[PDB]
């Protein structure tokens, strides 16, 4: 069947870490203070890039034990993601930010269904209270094989999906990234909302759309609260 | 098919830890005593929140190696759960409470006119005070989406028929087991959390096994790991951590 | 279909550990001797409980890297399993017994009250055999569109299980099985523990049973652990470095 | 059905490592400098082997947390791979290159569809900006069993695959290695490109070919950026 | 359907380890020399057992990161495997040989007094070949819907295996297989060990066999480990830092 076609924007890194609190507590106070200052100077550089419209980023603390902090970073090139990851890992604070999970993808718009397009391809991440991230595949199993469907069938299934999503306009903003050939699943799904319950409302409602019911295969789900840089010192205080 | 609609209550955290006994034994006695005091002061704050009907909590020791202790916490906001876990992780005792497993969810009632949020029994279930039973059981689950066993493709009517049989089986365990179902689609790795409370641990086995012969569980149930534990009264904490 | 009914006995803990030999070697000799004596005093308490018919236990060393030692403990309450686990972990030796795997279950058998029948009582509250070898694995019964054990009629399940029992009876006097149920208690639906003085019989039985329809069509298996009995009088020798 | 037949070339090792930055930072500067010099002397031996047309290699930094660096090594014998692996692990730098993932395979050409053949069997790895690696199986499940299809059925499916691949001529170079009997999947797929987006475009378009849609079973995907040896010192600077 | 019957020989341990190079480098030279000598003395005991025809062993270095070294050990009893494992873990070298993977099985010949035939005995109690290369992986046979190996008749399974044997005999003189059975003993149903002086033959054979119906329709495979022989006279050089 006819392959879908995409427009592609910025590369995206989701970098999840666990905080080594017991080790952090043993670090002398002035060294913790210097590590927090060093980290915030790094983020200052990211903010400069964002203000110049050459990238975007967001920082969230993650609920539960799967992760404690998320750095979501969008850049025009894969090399810039490698350099930002490397610079972060060389900070003192990163010695206490243990690997938890990561995702490499690229902002994607598809063929199924201008300044407005560019705002989506090169998104400034919203400053919402909450974030949700999970990866997904579309199933290739028996009669539930998305990639064997005709283009017309896939278009109609996506139309129904979009109708459900439009009900959550003004409540949730989604950034879909494509990762076929780049990471372990086929898409990254990032949701932003000021009400975390809307993540549950939207995703559960969509599970009854036929495209999700028959073809969705989901990875792990991460939910978090925004970490304003002015709260970093407080958050890491011990 | 028609999407299920939900009533949603308090946010829920299941926080499971393993105890680092070998490291705890090397900590000087007075530092252990201070760590236990500090932990109990934290829980005292949770008890105040519960007495004010603004949350609930439960603490259980877990049998086997998957975990040693469970803190189950209900709060009106996700932020409050995050603040409680951060405060816990900043205690001295938490340095010896190694991560084992966790679960993030919301208390959920289904739709399987009056506003249900105003109904007394609904409010009692949406914002529950957790029972102080001898035993607890926790596991997560999904409903299957495979071939002709696809729960989410069934009509609303078909799903209601299947759930009526489930409820009939569950009502046989009235007065023996209380369930708290939380929803986690969009929040964690499975679709629901199932927490059972009972004064007789065998009832966990009796209920779940009997329910496995109801078609909804037999045909659509997909289960994660099962955690079973015994209640840890706060007055026993010092004794439990004594070395 | 009609739900199966079960008879339930003692709670069961399978506690598997790996031995941290490299760390154990650095512990001074007299501290190792003290640790062994402390462990043996704990086991002496378990033996007292068994002699009073209020529980049972078995200790086996496990072949391969999945585990090195197994403590199998039966008690009348879940609380006692928690207390025994906690007491073991507070010993010095336990600092060198790293977690490997564990299983929590209840001894299970599938008008007169069966709980008053002598043979039922002997199986629900069993004294564990002191055989040369042990084998443990957990299992589920399949729930798939084509073959779903829990959707079968009671009569279909009974027929499948009669054939199973016919195959097992051929191994009478060669292998003793203790089946525990773990629905609602652990990650699989049953625990299977086999005891025999000839480890080959584990292979003979399980492989033959795999051609019974109940196992071929519905068996879903976890990991298999095989071990050799560790008499307490050999513990010091086993831990000698 | 009729088994496929293969021509086989050099053995291939994909050796993925994570960098232990926190430990590297505690090593004295002159010892870090010596470690980098020792590593570069080892790579100099690899370059000599390649110039003599007795093997090939490539070094890439990997984005995300699955790995930080990839050494891809082609040699005529499995023993030579064992020896290179052992020599690398005996360097000081390797103490800070923690195991992440590895793959053992052999360059393979099939009979589905001379100097040119030898240039494919014994390839000089390209110096492209980016690399992508993942392993795969072909499905044996239900009605989708590749190995029970006839030879002619498989040839037709592969003809369509090749037609899609030729559209990416001059943009992506693939090196397919076979690993049945040698590692956990059936093939290794390595893609080289100066445009990382082409990995996504190619792999995603190929997922709509029937052979990939119905039979592809994929492992983890690793994507990286070339590490010139003249940049190693800078990359490891702390 | 009719259960397969087996002739069974020596028990088999596959013990895979990763080498802790960074820690080994910090051990003083004379202690590394002592550790190597102690290890070689242990292997000398194994060689004595083999020369007396009471067991066999092989040592290979494994390519890639899944493992670095393989000890494959055959003994008449499970107890002896457990004792060899324990004696190895108590050597100094073993402190730098981290667990990677293990497999417990028993040499198996199927029926698809034999124990006195010399040729049967050479297969039940094999002297492991000293080939350049080794390959190991475990496998199951599928039990899924209407592709269920254990539901086939004895005659159906025999015919499928006849075709398998036809493909294998083409690799006579190039590859030697040792099949062990592990139902009831480890996590899969069989262990497959291949020996060859040409590692490519592992790929040629396994890939060609994947188009036989028994492998195509019923084969379920675990991880594959491939290695190069480690002569004892090379151990010192291999561990030299």
The answer to whether the Cβ–Cβ distance between C147 and E151 falls below 8 Å is no
Mark the breaks in chain E: residue after which each occurs, C to N over 2.5 Å.
Answer: 112
The C-alpha angle with vertex D45 and arms to D43 and D49, in degrees rounded to 5, equals 115
CATH architecture of D128-238: 2-Layer Sandwich (3.30)
Count the neighbouring beta carbons within 10 Å of the beta carbon of residue B107.
23
What are B58's strand-pairing partners?
A: B72
Of the candidates D190, A220, C70, the one whose C-alpha atom is nearest the C-alpha of residue B190 is A220
Please report where in the chains the tokens 């490592």 appear, as a residue.
D17
CA E129 to chain centre: 11
> Distance between CA atoms of D200 and B200, rounded to whole angstroms?
55
Contact E93, E17 (CB under 8 A): no
Buried b (16+ CB within 10 A) or exposed e, E121-155: eebbbbebbebbbbbbbbbbbbbbeebbbbebeee
Q: How many residues does chain B have?
A: 243
Count the neighbouring beta carbons within 10 Å of the beta carbon of residue A52.
8
Secondary structure letter of residue D4 according to DSSP:
P
Measured CA distances, C132 to C153, C197, E79 (Å): 40, 5, 9
Contact C38, C93 (CB under 8 A): yes
| C131-241 homologous superfamily | Apc35880; domain 1 (3.30.70.1030)
> Distance between CA atoms of D192 and E80, rounded to whole angstroms?
51
Buried b (16+ CB within 10 A) or exposed e, D111-146: eeeeeeeeeeebbebeebbbbbbbbbbbbbeeebbb
Tell me which of A208, A216, A222 to substitute to probe the interface with B (most B C-beta atoms closer than 10 Å): A208
Contact C192, C136 (CB under 8 A): yes
Contact A179, D60 (CB under 8 A): no
> Distance between CA atoms of E186 and C63, rounded to whole angstroms?
10
B139 given a catalytic annotation:
yes
Contact B99, B17 (CB under 8 A): yes
Please report where in the chains the tokens 């598997």 appear, as a residue.
C16
> Distance between CA atoms of D169 and A8, rounded to whole angstroms?
21
Chains that touch C (3 or more CB pairs under 8 A): B, E
Say how many Å lie between the first and final Cα of chain B, rounded.
58
Span(s) in chain B for CATH 3.30.70.1030:
1-132, 133-243
**Technique used by the depositors:** X-ray
> Distance between CA atoms of E29 and D174, rounded to whole angstroms?
46
Collapsing DSSP states into helix, strand and coil, what is residue A4? coil
Count the neighbouring beta carbons within 10 Å of the beta carbon of residue D49.
19
Contact B65, C99 (CB under 8 A): yes
- Known catalytic residues of A are 134
DSSP A170-191: TT-EEEEEE-TTTSSSSEEEEE
> Distance between CA atoms of B200 and C13, rounded to whole angstroms?
17
> Distance between CA atoms of A159 and A139, rounded to whole angstroms?
18
Count the neighbouring beta carbons within 10 Å of the beta carbon of residue A131.
26
DSSP chain E: -PPP-EEEEEEEEEEEEEE-HHHHHHS-HHHHHHHHHHHHHHHHHHHHHHHTTS-EEEEEEEPSSS-SEEEEEEESSHHHHHHHHHHHHTSSGGGGEEEEEEEEEEEEEE---GGG-HHHHHHHSPPPP--SEEEEEEEEE-EETTEEGGGS-HHHHHHHHHHHHHHHHTTTTTEEEEEEE-TTTSSSSEEEEEEES-THHHHHHHHHHTTSHHHHHHEEE---EEEEE--GGGHHHHT--
Contact E211, E164 (CB under 8 A): no
Contact A203, A149 (CB under 8 A): no
Measured CA distances, B231 to A52, B57, B207, B227 (Å): 56, 12, 20, 13
Phi then psi dihedrals of residue B64, to 5 deg: 90, -175
Residue A238 at interface with chain B, using a CB cutoff of 8 Å: yes
Contact A49, A124 (CB under 8 A): no
Give residues with Cβ within 8 angstroms of C173, minimum separation 6: none
Secondary structure letter of residue C129 according to DSSP:
P
The answer to whether the Cβ–Cβ distance between B61 and C82 falls below 8 Å is yes
Pick from E90, E99, E104: which is nearest to C241 by CB? E90
Q: Å from B53 to nearest chain C CA? A: 30
Collapsing DSSP states into helix, strand and coil, what is residue D140? strand
> Distance between CA atoms of A39 and A49, rounded to whole angstroms?
16
Residue B184 at interface with chain A, using a CB cutoff of 8 Å: yes
Collapsing DSSP states into helix, strand and coil, what is residue D229? helix
What are B61's strand-pairing partners?
A: B69, B230
| E1-130 homologous superfamily | Apc35880; domain 1 (3.30.70.1030)
Count the neighbouring beta carbons within 10 Å of the beta carbon of residue B52.
8
DSSP A48-70: HHHHTTS-EEEEEEESSSS-SEE
Contact B163, B216 (CB under 8 A): yes
Burial, C132: exposed, middle or buried (Cβ in 10 Å; 0-12, 13-18, 19+)? middle
Q: Enter the tokens of residue B110.
A: 């289904």
> Distance between CA atoms of D102 and D123, rounded to whole angstroms?
20
User: Chain A contacts of B150, Cβ < 8 Å?
Assistant: 213-214
Task: Find the closest chain E residue to D10 by CA distance.
Answer: E200
Query: Does E17 show up as a binding residue in the annotation?
Result: no
Secondary-structure breakdown of chain A: helix, strand, coil percentages, each rounded to the nearest 5? 40, 30, 30
Pick from A89, A99, A104: which is nearest to D223 by CB? A104
Q: Enter the tokens of residue A123.
A: 């998104």
Buried b (16+ CB within 10 A) or exposed e, E203-228: bbbbbbbbbbebbbbbbbbbebbbbb
Write out the H or E segment, with its range, that includes residue C195: strand C190-196
Q: Å from C159 to nearest chain E CA? A: 15
Q: Enter the tokens of residue A105.
A: 């993808």
Alpha-carbon Rg for chain D in angstroms: 19
Of the candidates A211, A59, A231, the one whose C-alpha atom is nearest the C-alpha of residue A149 is A211
CATH architecture of B133-243: 2-Layer Sandwich (3.30)
Known binding-site positions of A for Fe-coproporphyrin III: 120, 134-138, 161, 174, 212
Of the candidates E189, E59, D210, the one whose C-alpha atom is nearest the C-alpha of residue C209 is E189
Residue B187 half-sphere exposure, CB side, CA atoms within 13 Å? 29
Q: Enter the tokens of residue C142.
A: 């399949």
Q: Is D222 left (phi over 0), alpha (psi -120 to 50) or beta?
A: beta
Tell me which of E184, E187, E223 to substitute to probe the interface with C (most C C-beta atoms closer than 10 Å): E184
> Distance between CA atoms of D59 and D224, rounded to whole angstroms?
9
Q: Is D196 left (phi over 0), alpha (psi -120 to 50) or beta?
A: alpha
**Which of the following is catalytic: E112, E137, E150, E207?**
E137
Residue E82 at interface with chain C, using a CB cutoff of 8 Å: yes
> Distance between CA atoms of A130 and B185, rounded to whole angstroms?
16
- Please report, for chain A, how many H helices and E strands are present, in that order: 8, 11
User: Chain A contacts of B145, Cβ < 8 Å?
Assistant: 213-214, 216
User: Chain A contacts of D225, Cβ < 8 Å?
Assistant: 78-79, 82
Please report where in the chains the tokens 């059975």 appear, as a residue.
E181
> Distance between CA atoms of C5 and C15, rounded to whole angstroms?
28
Beta pairing, strands E143-144 & E56-62: unpaired
Secondary structure letter of residue A104 according to DSSP:
E
Collapsing DSSP states into helix, strand and coil, what is residue A199? helix
Span(s) in chain C for CATH 3.30.70.1030:
1-130, 131-241
Pick from D81, D102, D180: which is nearest to E203 by CB? D180
Pick from A130, A197, A208: which is nearest to B106 by CB? A197
Residue C203 at interface with chain E, using a CB cutoff of 8 Å: yes
Residue range B1-132 in CATH 1.10.10.60: no
Collapsing DSSP states into helix, strand and coil, what is residue C194? strand
Give residues with Cβ within 8 angstroms of E15, minimum separation 6: C64, C65, E70, E71, E72, E73, E85, E88, E102
Chains that touch B (3 or more CB pairs under 8 A): A, C
Q: Enter the tokens of residue C86.
A: 């906690």
The answer to whether the Cβ–Cβ distance between E150 and C194 falls below 8 Å is no
The C-alpha angle with vertex A22 and arms to A18 and A25, in degrees rounded to 5, equals 110
Residue E1 half-sphere exposure, CB side, CA atoms within 13 Å? 18
Count the neighbouring beta carbons within 10 Å of the beta carbon of residue E233.
8
Alpha-helical regions (H) of D70-168: 78-89, 115-121, 151-166
Contact E218, E147 (CB under 8 A): yes
Q: Å from A66 to nearest chain B CA? A: 8
> Distance between CA atoms of D234 and B97, rounded to whole angstroms?
40
Alpha-helical regions (H) of C125-153: none
Residue C80 at interface with chain B, using a CB cutoff of 8 Å: no
> Distance between CA atoms of D202 and D170, rounded to whole angstroms?
12
> Distance between CA atoms of D236 and D226, rounded to whole angstroms?
15
Count the neighbouring beta carbons within 10 Å of the beta carbon of residue C110.
11
Burial, E77: exposed, middle or buried (Cβ in 10 Å; 0-12, 13-18, 19+)? middle
Span(s) in chain A for CATH 3.30.70.1030:
1-127, 128-238
Phi then psi dihedrals of residue D2, to 5 deg: -75, 125
> Distance between CA atoms of D52 and D84, rounded to whole angstroms?
17
**Resolution of the experimental model in angstroms, please?**
1.8
Give residues with Cβ within 8 angstroms of B68, minimum separation 6: B17, B18, B19, B61, B62, B100
Residue A228 at interface with chain B, using a CB cutoff of 8 Å: no
> Distance between CA atoms of A102 and D67, rounded to whole angstroms?
11
What are A6's strand-pairing partners?
A: A110
Q: Is the dihedral of CA B93, B95, B101, B103 positive or negative?
A: positive
> Distance between CA atoms of C48 and C59, rounded to whole angstroms?
15
Residue C66 at interface with chain E, using a CB cutoff of 8 Å: yes
> Distance between CA atoms of A26 and A7, rounded to whole angstroms?
49
Buried b (16+ CB within 10 A) or exposed e, E22-47: bebeebeeeebeebbeebeebeeebe
> Distance between CA atoms of E85 and E82, rounded to whole angstroms?
5
Give residues with Cβ within 8 angstroms of C202, minimum separation 6: C133, C135, C175, C194, C196, C226, E184, E185
Give residues with Cβ within 8 angstroms of D153, minimum separation 6: none
> Distance between CA atoms of B211 and B201, rounded to whole angstroms?
16
Residue A62 half-sphere exposure, CB side, CA atoms within 13 Å? 30
Give residues with Cβ within 8 angstroms of D190, minimum separation 6: D14, D72, D131, D132, D133, D174, D175, D176, D177
CA E237 to chain centre: 25
Of the candidates E59, E104, E97, E101, the one whose C-alpha atom is nearest the C-alpha of residue E81 is E104
> Distance between CA atoms of A40 and D40, rounded to whole angstroms?
35
CATH architecture of A1-127: 2-Layer Sandwich (3.30)
Residue B179 at interface with chain C, using a CB cutoff of 8 Å: no
Residue E9 half-sphere exposure, CB side, CA atoms within 13 Å? 27
Contact E138, E190 (CB under 8 A): yes
Collapsing DSSP states into helix, strand and coil, what is residue C88? helix
Contact A27, A91 (CB under 8 A): no
Strands (E) located in chain A: 6-19, 56-62, 69-75, 97-110, 130-138, 140-141, 144-145, 173-178, 187-193, 216-218, 222-226
> Distance between CA atoms of E198 and D97, rounded to whole angstroms?
31
Q: Å from B86 to nearest chain A CA? A: 8
Q: Enter the tokens of residue E221.
A: 């495979």
Pick from E85, E101, E184: which is nearest to C205 by CB? E184
Contact B111, B122 (CB under 8 A): no
Contact D185, D104 (CB under 8 A): no
Give residues with Cβ within 8 angstroms of E147, minimum separation 6: E217, E218
Of the candidates E152, E228, E232, the one whose C-alpha atom is nearest the C-alpha of residue E197 is E228
Pick from D101, D140, D182: which is nearest to E216 by CB? D140
User: Chain C contacts of E89, Cβ < 8 Å?
Assistant: 19, 21
- Please report, for chain D, how many H helices and E strands are present, in that order: 8, 11
> Distance between CA atoms of D36 and D22, rounded to whole angstroms?
17
Count the neighbouring beta carbons within 10 Å of the beta carbon of residue D238.
12
Residue B236 at interface with chain C, using a CB cutoff of 8 Å: no
DSSP chain B: -PPP-EEEEEEEEEEEEEE-HHHHHHS-HHHHHHHHHHHHHHHHHHHHHHHTTS-EEEEEEE-SSS-SEEEEEEESSHHHHHHHHHHHHTSSGGGGEEEEEEEEEEEEEE-----GGG-HHHHHHHSPPPP--SEEEEEEEEE-EETTEEGGGS-HHHHHHHHHHHHHHHHTTTTT-EEEEEE-TTTSSSSEEEEEEES-THHHHHHHHHHTTSHHHHHHEEE---EEEEE--GGGHHHHT--
Contact C64, E13 (CB under 8 A): yes
> Distance between CA atoms of D186 and D165, rounded to whole angstroms?
20
Q: Enter the tokens of residue D36.
A: 């980098």
Give residues with Cβ within 8 angstroms of E88, minimum separation 6: E15, E42, E71, E94, E97
């Amino acid at each position: 069947s006819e392959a879908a076609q995409t427009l592609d924007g910025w590369y995206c890194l989701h970098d999840f870490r666990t905080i080594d609190w017991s080790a952090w507590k043993t670090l002398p106070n002035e060294e913790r203070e210097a590590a927090i200052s060093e980290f915030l100077a790094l983020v200052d550089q990211w903010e400069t890039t964002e203000s110049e419209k050459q990238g975007s980023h967001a920082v969230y603390t993650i609920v539960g034990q799967k992760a404690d902090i998320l750095f979501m970073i969008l850049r025009p090139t894969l090399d810039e993601l490698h350099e930002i990851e490397t610079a972060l890992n060389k900070t003192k604070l990163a010695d206490y930010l243990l690997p938890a999970y990561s995702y490499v993808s690229v902002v994607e718009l598809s063929n199924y269904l201008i300044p407005e397009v560019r705002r989506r391809l090169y998104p400034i991440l919203p400053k919402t209270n909450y974030i949700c991230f999970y990866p997904m595949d579309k199933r290739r199993q028996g009669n539930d094989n998305w990639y064997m469907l005709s283009m017309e069938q896939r278009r109609e299934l996506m139309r129904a999906h979009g109708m459900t999503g439009r009900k959550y306009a003004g409540k949730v903003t989604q950034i879909i990234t494509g990762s076929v050939g780049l990471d372990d699943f086929e898409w990254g799904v990032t949701l932003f909302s000021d009400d975390a319950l809307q993540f549950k409302k939207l995703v559960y409602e969509m599970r009854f759309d036929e495209v999700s019911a028959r073809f969705g295969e989901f990875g792990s789900f991460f939910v978090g609260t925004r970490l304003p840089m002015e709260n970093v010192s407080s958050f890491f205080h011990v």
